[PDB]
Design a protein around this ligand. Structure first.
Ligand SMILES: Nc1ncnc2c1ncn2[C@@H]1O[C@H](CSCC[C@H](N)C(=O)O)[C@@H](O)[C@H]1O
Lengths: 6, 227
Protein backbone atom coordinates (compact mmCIF):
# COMPACT_ATOMS: atom_id res chain seq x y z
CA UNK A 1 0.00 0.00 0.00
CA UNK A 2 0.88 3.65 0.08
CA UNK A 3 2.81 4.04 3.33
CA UNK A 4 4.79 6.27 5.71
CA UNK A 5 8.49 6.63 4.80
CA UNK A 6 10.30 4.46 7.37
CA UNK B 1 26.35 2.01 0.57
CA UNK B 2 22.69 1.59 -0.42
CA UNK B 3 21.44 -1.83 -1.34
CA UNK B 4 20.63 -2.41 -5.06
CA UNK B 5 18.97 -5.76 -5.04
CA UNK B 6 16.47 -7.77 -3.09
CA UNK B 7 19.18 -10.40 -2.55
CA UNK B 8 20.85 -7.93 -0.17
CA UNK B 9 17.74 -7.53 1.94
CA UNK B 10 15.67 -10.75 1.88
CA UNK B 11 16.95 -13.26 4.40
CA UNK B 12 14.74 -16.15 3.31
CA UNK B 13 12.73 -16.02 0.12
CA UNK B 14 10.10 -18.60 1.17
CA UNK B 15 9.45 -16.61 4.38
CA UNK B 16 9.38 -13.31 2.44
CA UNK B 17 6.41 -14.69 0.42
CA UNK B 18 4.76 -16.63 3.31
CA UNK B 19 4.82 -13.66 5.69
CA UNK B 20 3.28 -11.37 3.05
CA UNK B 21 0.47 -13.91 2.45
CA UNK B 22 -0.29 -14.09 6.16
CA UNK B 23 -0.20 -10.28 6.39
CA UNK B 24 -2.80 -9.73 3.64
CA UNK B 25 -5.02 -12.54 4.98
CA UNK B 26 -5.63 -10.35 8.09
CA UNK B 27 -6.28 -7.03 6.33
CA UNK B 28 -9.91 -5.91 5.98
CA UNK B 29 -11.31 -6.39 2.49
CA UNK B 30 -11.97 -2.66 2.13
CA UNK B 31 -10.60 0.31 0.22
CA UNK B 32 -8.88 1.50 3.39
CA UNK B 33 -7.38 -1.96 3.72
CA UNK B 34 -6.12 -1.88 0.16
CA UNK B 35 -4.60 1.54 0.77
CA UNK B 36 -3.03 0.94 4.14
CA UNK B 37 -5.11 3.49 6.04
CA UNK B 38 -4.98 5.94 3.13
CA UNK B 39 -8.41 5.01 1.63
CA UNK B 40 -9.10 8.74 1.44
CA UNK B 41 -6.48 9.26 -1.36
CA UNK B 42 -8.22 6.84 -3.73
CA UNK B 43 -9.92 9.45 -5.88
CA UNK B 44 -6.65 11.48 -6.34
CA UNK B 45 -4.97 8.24 -7.40
CA UNK B 46 -7.72 7.13 -9.82
CA UNK B 47 -8.00 10.56 -11.47
CA UNK B 48 -4.26 10.63 -12.11
CA UNK B 49 -4.16 7.06 -13.36
CA UNK B 50 -6.99 7.80 -15.75
CA UNK B 51 -5.23 10.84 -17.25
CA UNK B 52 -2.02 8.82 -17.52
CA UNK B 53 -3.77 5.96 -19.33
CA UNK B 54 -5.73 8.20 -21.67
CA UNK B 55 -2.48 9.40 -23.24
CA UNK B 56 -2.27 5.86 -24.83
CA UNK B 57 -5.88 5.62 -26.00
CA UNK B 58 -5.71 8.40 -28.59
CA UNK B 59 -6.42 7.45 -32.19
CA UNK B 60 -3.34 6.73 -34.34
CA UNK B 61 -0.95 3.92 -35.29
CA UNK B 62 -0.09 3.02 -31.81
CA UNK B 63 -3.48 3.31 -30.09
CA UNK B 64 -3.83 0.87 -27.20
CA UNK B 65 -7.02 -1.20 -27.51
CA UNK B 66 -9.92 -1.35 -25.11
CA UNK B 67 -11.03 -5.02 -25.27
CA UNK B 68 -9.33 -6.40 -22.14
CA UNK B 69 -7.25 -5.33 -19.19
CA UNK B 70 -5.49 -7.33 -16.46
CA UNK B 71 -5.44 -5.89 -12.90
CA UNK B 72 -2.44 -7.32 -11.03
CA UNK B 73 -2.48 -7.46 -7.22
CA UNK B 74 -6.04 -6.26 -7.77
CA UNK B 75 -7.26 -6.84 -4.23
CA UNK B 76 -10.95 -6.18 -3.91
CA UNK B 77 -10.88 -4.35 -7.28
CA UNK B 78 -10.60 -0.66 -6.31
CA UNK B 79 -8.82 0.04 -9.60
CA UNK B 80 -10.93 -2.45 -11.57
CA UNK B 81 -14.07 -0.69 -10.41
CA UNK B 82 -13.22 2.95 -10.96
CA UNK B 83 -10.52 2.97 -13.66
CA UNK B 84 -10.59 -0.18 -15.73
CA UNK B 85 -14.21 -1.42 -16.05
CA UNK B 86 -15.35 1.90 -17.47
CA UNK B 87 -12.71 1.82 -20.22
CA UNK B 88 -12.30 -1.93 -21.07
CA UNK B 89 -14.93 -4.35 -22.36
CA UNK B 90 -13.64 -7.02 -19.97
CA UNK B 91 -11.21 -7.14 -17.11
CA UNK B 92 -9.31 -10.01 -15.52
CA UNK B 93 -8.10 -9.80 -11.90
CA UNK B 94 -5.20 -11.58 -10.24
CA UNK B 95 -4.45 -11.53 -6.55
CA UNK B 96 -2.95 -13.81 -3.98
CA UNK B 97 -5.66 -13.20 -1.35
CA UNK B 98 -8.79 -15.28 -1.94
CA UNK B 99 -10.89 -13.24 0.54
CA UNK B 100 -10.26 -10.09 -1.54
CA UNK B 101 -11.42 -11.72 -4.79
CA UNK B 102 -14.57 -13.02 -2.98
CA UNK B 103 -15.23 -9.49 -1.67
CA UNK B 104 -14.67 -8.10 -5.19
CA UNK B 105 -17.79 -9.81 -6.43
CA UNK B 106 -19.81 -7.68 -3.98
CA UNK B 107 -17.66 -4.52 -4.24
CA UNK B 108 -17.82 -4.38 -8.03
CA UNK B 109 -21.63 -4.66 -8.21
CA UNK B 110 -23.38 -5.03 -11.56
CA UNK B 111 -20.42 -3.78 -13.61
CA UNK B 112 -18.40 -6.60 -12.07
CA UNK B 113 -20.34 -8.97 -14.33
CA UNK B 114 -17.72 -7.89 -16.95
CA UNK B 115 -14.83 -9.25 -14.86
CA UNK B 116 -14.03 -12.39 -16.72
CA UNK B 117 -11.29 -14.32 -14.81
CA UNK B 118 -10.64 -14.04 -11.09
CA UNK B 119 -7.23 -15.61 -10.71
CA UNK B 120 -6.20 -16.42 -7.15
CA UNK B 121 -2.45 -16.81 -7.46
CA UNK B 122 0.78 -15.06 -6.63
CA UNK B 123 2.20 -13.03 -9.51
CA UNK B 124 5.32 -15.12 -9.14
CA UNK B 125 3.28 -18.16 -10.13
CA UNK B 126 1.03 -16.51 -12.76
CA UNK B 127 1.49 -16.85 -16.53
CA UNK B 128 -1.04 -14.65 -18.34
CA UNK B 129 -2.41 -15.97 -21.61
CA UNK B 130 -0.41 -14.88 -24.70
CA UNK B 131 -1.84 -12.08 -26.82
CA UNK B 132 -4.72 -11.36 -24.40
CA UNK B 133 -4.47 -7.92 -22.80
CA UNK B 134 -4.42 -4.36 -24.07
CA UNK B 135 -3.39 -3.02 -20.68
CA UNK B 136 -1.69 -4.88 -17.83
CA UNK B 137 -2.04 -2.72 -14.72
CA UNK B 138 0.39 -3.45 -11.84
CA UNK B 139 -0.23 -1.19 -8.84
CA UNK B 140 1.03 -1.30 -5.28
CA UNK B 141 2.32 -4.89 -5.49
CA UNK B 142 5.75 -4.99 -7.16
CA UNK B 143 7.41 -4.69 -3.77
CA UNK B 144 6.05 -8.17 -2.98
CA UNK B 145 8.21 -9.87 -5.61
CA UNK B 146 11.95 -10.52 -5.58
CA UNK B 147 13.95 -8.89 -8.38
CA UNK B 148 14.25 -12.18 -10.23
CA UNK B 149 10.52 -12.90 -9.93
CA UNK B 150 9.58 -9.33 -10.86
CA UNK B 151 11.80 -9.47 -14.01
CA UNK B 152 10.29 -12.86 -14.94
CA UNK B 153 6.72 -11.70 -14.33
CA UNK B 154 7.29 -8.63 -16.56
CA UNK B 155 8.67 -10.92 -19.31
CA UNK B 156 5.50 -13.06 -19.06
CA UNK B 157 3.36 -9.90 -19.15
CA UNK B 158 5.17 -8.74 -22.31
CA UNK B 159 4.17 -12.02 -23.96
CA UNK B 160 0.52 -11.51 -23.03
CA UNK B 161 0.14 -8.03 -24.63
CA UNK B 162 -2.07 -7.56 -27.66
CA UNK B 163 -0.69 -5.41 -30.52
CA UNK B 164 -0.19 -1.88 -29.19
CA UNK B 165 -0.64 -3.09 -25.63
CA UNK B 166 1.09 -1.61 -22.62
CA UNK B 167 2.11 -2.55 -19.11
CA UNK B 168 1.63 0.07 -16.43
CA UNK B 169 3.48 -0.08 -13.11
CA UNK B 170 2.36 2.39 -10.40
CA UNK B 171 4.06 1.97 -7.08
CA UNK B 172 5.95 3.28 -4.14
CA UNK B 173 9.54 4.35 -4.90
CA UNK B 174 12.43 4.77 -2.42
CA UNK B 175 14.61 7.86 -2.55
CA UNK B 176 17.69 5.56 -2.64
CA UNK B 177 18.32 1.81 -2.59
CA UNK B 178 16.10 -1.13 -1.70
CA UNK B 179 14.32 -0.92 1.62
CA UNK B 180 12.71 -3.89 3.44
CA UNK B 181 9.39 -3.50 5.28
CA UNK B 182 9.45 -6.59 7.53
CA UNK B 183 5.89 -6.03 8.80
CA UNK B 184 4.03 -6.45 5.46
CA UNK B 185 7.03 -8.35 3.99
CA UNK B 186 7.70 -6.14 0.95
CA UNK B 187 10.45 -3.93 -0.46
CA UNK B 188 10.47 -0.36 -1.79
CA UNK B 189 13.06 0.23 -4.60
CA UNK B 190 14.55 3.44 -5.99
CA UNK B 191 13.84 4.62 -9.54
CA UNK B 192 17.23 3.38 -10.85
CA UNK B 193 16.56 -0.13 -9.52
CA UNK B 194 13.06 -0.27 -11.00
CA UNK B 195 14.30 1.00 -14.38
CA UNK B 196 17.05 -1.65 -14.31
CA UNK B 197 14.51 -4.39 -13.74
CA UNK B 198 12.28 -3.08 -16.52
CA UNK B 199 15.24 -3.06 -18.92
CA UNK B 200 16.18 -6.63 -17.83
CA UNK B 201 12.66 -7.75 -18.76
CA UNK B 202 13.14 -6.58 -22.39
CA UNK B 203 10.81 -3.59 -21.89
CA UNK B 204 11.12 0.12 -22.66
CA UNK B 205 9.62 3.21 -21.11
CA UNK B 206 6.91 5.09 -22.91
CA UNK B 207 6.33 7.50 -20.05
CA UNK B 208 7.13 8.04 -16.35
CA UNK B 209 5.22 10.38 -14.02
CA UNK B 210 5.37 11.24 -10.33
CA UNK B 211 1.97 11.14 -8.53
CA UNK B 212 1.09 14.57 -7.21
CA UNK B 213 -1.09 15.68 -4.30
CA UNK B 214 -0.18 12.90 -1.90
CA UNK B 215 0.42 13.25 1.83
CA UNK B 216 3.98 14.50 2.50
CA UNK B 217 4.81 11.62 4.81
CA UNK B 218 4.44 8.69 2.43
CA UNK B 219 6.83 7.22 -0.12
CA UNK B 220 6.72 8.94 -3.49
CA UNK B 221 4.64 7.10 -6.05
CA UNK B 222 5.46 6.89 -9.78
CA UNK B 223 3.72 5.52 -12.83
CA UNK B 224 5.58 3.89 -15.73
CA UNK B 225 4.05 2.91 -19.11
CA UNK B 226 6.00 0.14 -20.80
CA UNK B 227 6.14 -2.00 -23.95
N1 LIG C 1 2.85 -12.11 -4.48
C1 LIG C 1 1.63 -11.57 -4.75
N2 LIG C 1 0.94 -11.82 -5.89
C2 LIG C 1 -0.27 -11.25 -6.14
N3 LIG C 1 -0.87 -10.42 -5.27
C3 LIG C 1 -0.26 -10.07 -4.11
C4 LIG C 1 1.03 -10.63 -3.77
N4 LIG C 1 1.42 -10.11 -2.58
C5 LIG C 1 0.42 -9.29 -2.17
N5 LIG C 1 -0.57 -9.27 -3.08
C6 LIG C 1 -1.78 -8.44 -3.08
O1 LIG C 1 -1.31 -7.10 -3.28
C7 LIG C 1 -2.39 -6.21 -2.88
C8 LIG C 1 -1.78 -5.02 -2.20
S1 LIG C 1 -2.96 -3.75 -1.73
C9 LIG C 1 -3.22 -2.89 -3.29
C10 LIG C 1 -4.46 -3.39 -4.03
C11 LIG C 1 -4.67 -2.75 -5.43
N6 LIG C 1 -3.46 -2.86 -6.29
C12 LIG C 1 -5.01 -1.32 -5.25
O2 LIG C 1 -4.18 -0.41 -5.52
O3 LIG C 1 -6.13 -1.02 -4.76
C13 LIG C 1 -3.33 -7.05 -1.99
O4 LIG C 1 -4.59 -7.29 -2.65
C14 LIG C 1 -2.58 -8.37 -1.80
O5 LIG C 1 -3.36 -9.55 -1.67
Amino acid sequence: SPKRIA
Amino acid sequence: VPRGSTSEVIEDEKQFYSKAKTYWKQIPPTVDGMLGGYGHISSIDINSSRKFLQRFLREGPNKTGTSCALDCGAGIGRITKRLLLPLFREVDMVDITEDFLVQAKTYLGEEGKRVRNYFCCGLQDFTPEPDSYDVIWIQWVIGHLTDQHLAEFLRRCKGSLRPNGIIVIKDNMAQEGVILDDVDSSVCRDLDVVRRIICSAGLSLLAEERQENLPDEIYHVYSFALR
